[PDB]
Design a binder for this molecule. Structure first.
Ligand SMILES: Nc1ccn([C@@H]2O[C@H](COP(=O)(O)OP(=O)(O)OC[C@@H](O)[C@@H](O)[C@@H](O)CO)[C@@H](O)[C@H]2O)c(=O)n1
Ligand SMILES: Nc1ccn([C@@H]2O[C@H](COP(=O)(O)OP(=O)(O)OC[C@@H](O)[C@@H](O)[C@@H](O)CO)[C@@H](O)[C@H]2O)c(=O)n1
Lengths: 228, 237
């Protein structure tokens, strides 16, 4: 069993529901996952305020895949992931070989190739990240004023999503973490990295952007029009 | 004295059936290099605005300046270097052999292929270079940043709050830049990807100036589609 977890639990209307070429970003994203028959369930987690509106939007764009379920998101991004996990466990349980492909609702340009690679690398190695090589030199700062270090750019990668995990592995490593450890995370693959278990790399795409600021939405509107 | 070093070097010899190199390709009917150069021209603080370019492209650069009626005597076209930092040092050697280097000189280095920098960015670079001697133009990382030493598996995922996308300009006190460059071995030089790591390898500080999300580097066709959208929708306004 392969499960898809569309993360839309973050807070005009929230960015995930904004129109990209007369169509909510969430719909753009979800269409990619619908085309993959391998998914047992495609779960959209969203704030309680926006659950009925999400289901209205699905209806409005004539999407009625019974594989789709809308559930309530979490405190933080990782908590939303864990809510989707708890939903799967309390409705059909967790096989010890099940994987979940978590993906940002605001990353509507992921590709069929990206998803299929994610699922096969999760089946093989248990934890997967979607990245692209750093184009900018990457810099670090421990004070937001002066540089701390400038690593070898060759070893730096822009982390995207999907991020796909073995559900048992993800739950066990999340339980290993403290509340302080959890609070400093920014993605889900550091759950696995912090517990000293491997994370394979899948290559994303340069156009697999996160659409949150208005600048991003103009880039996304150009990517749509120019068929990128 | 404050100097601008527009980096348009390292363009390899190319056949005529390939489009023009990225620095010279048209963006809204204007070479990207000209878009970049216009911002520096508007700043009177600069004693010279030096464009370094491969030997093959010097005459074409000067034709291009003429074509867009650019006749600022502060602009000079010189031959670039073997690598990016070598191009910077060529600009330094030009400055020193034409005006000398005063100990209060700063140079504002910038990729010709980042045409969307702003007046704000350049001014902050100049003055932060005067105060702290070395400056990087960066933006807070939006993606989580990851490291891998084998292109297969992750080694580490640092705290994103401390990670930054390095952009340009990069601005230095010229003597400081020269001294720290002279300290480096050829191996160290070969592994650098920017100019601020010259200063960082020699354990001297580098101040941070915040850039802009549209201060993108135009190299791939994808970037040119993004850059045409930035132009059309007036997002650098
Ligand atoms: N309580 C919450 C908060 C947010 N969300 C969803 O999560 C998506 C991204 O959220 P956001 O746009 O704000 O970006 P983040 O700072 O969280 O980092 C992400 C970054 O790490 C990653 O894309 C990649 O880079 C790693 O490889 C959005 O769809 C939100 O709806 C959720 O479901 N519940
Ligand atoms: N012999 C050479 C080689 C390159 N150049 C110029 O350098 C510009 C960018 O070059 P390139 O697009 O190829 O990318 P780089 O690998 O050099 O990285 C840059 C990255 O570090 C920086 O933008 C930022 O991210 C860090 O803060 C281009 O205008 C080239 O003409 C030169 O004049 N002479």
């Amino acid at each position: 069993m392969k499960y898809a977890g569309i993360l839309a639990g973050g807070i005009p209307l929230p960015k995930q529901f904004l129109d990209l070429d007369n169509k909510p970003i969430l719909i753009h994203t979800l269409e990619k996952f619908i085309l993959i028959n391998d998914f047992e369930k495609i779960i959209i987690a969203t704030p309680q305020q926006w659950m009925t509106h999400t289901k209205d939007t699905l209806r409005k764009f004539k999407i009625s895949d019974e594989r789709i379920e809308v559930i309530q998101g979490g405190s933080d991004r990782n908590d939303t992931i864990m809510n989707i996990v708890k939903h799967i466990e309390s409705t059909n349980g967790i096989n010890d070989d099940d994987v979940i492909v978590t993906h940002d609702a605001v990353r509507p340009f992921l590709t069929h190739r990206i998803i299929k690679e994610n699922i096969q690398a999760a089946l093989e190695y248990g934890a997967v990240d979607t990245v692209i090589d750093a184009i900018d030199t990457i810099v670090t700062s421990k004070d937001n004023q002066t540089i701390d270090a400038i690593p070898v750019r060759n070893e730096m990668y822009q982390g995207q999503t999907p991020q796909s995990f073995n559900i048992n592995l993800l739950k066990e490593s999340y339980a290993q973490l403290s509340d302080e450890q959890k609070s400093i995370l920014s993605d889900a693959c550091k759950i696995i990295v912090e517990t000293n278990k491997p994370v394979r790399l899948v290559k994303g795409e340069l156009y697999n952007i996160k659409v949150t600021t208005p600048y991003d939405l103009k880039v996304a509107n150009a990517i749509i029009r120019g068929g990128i």
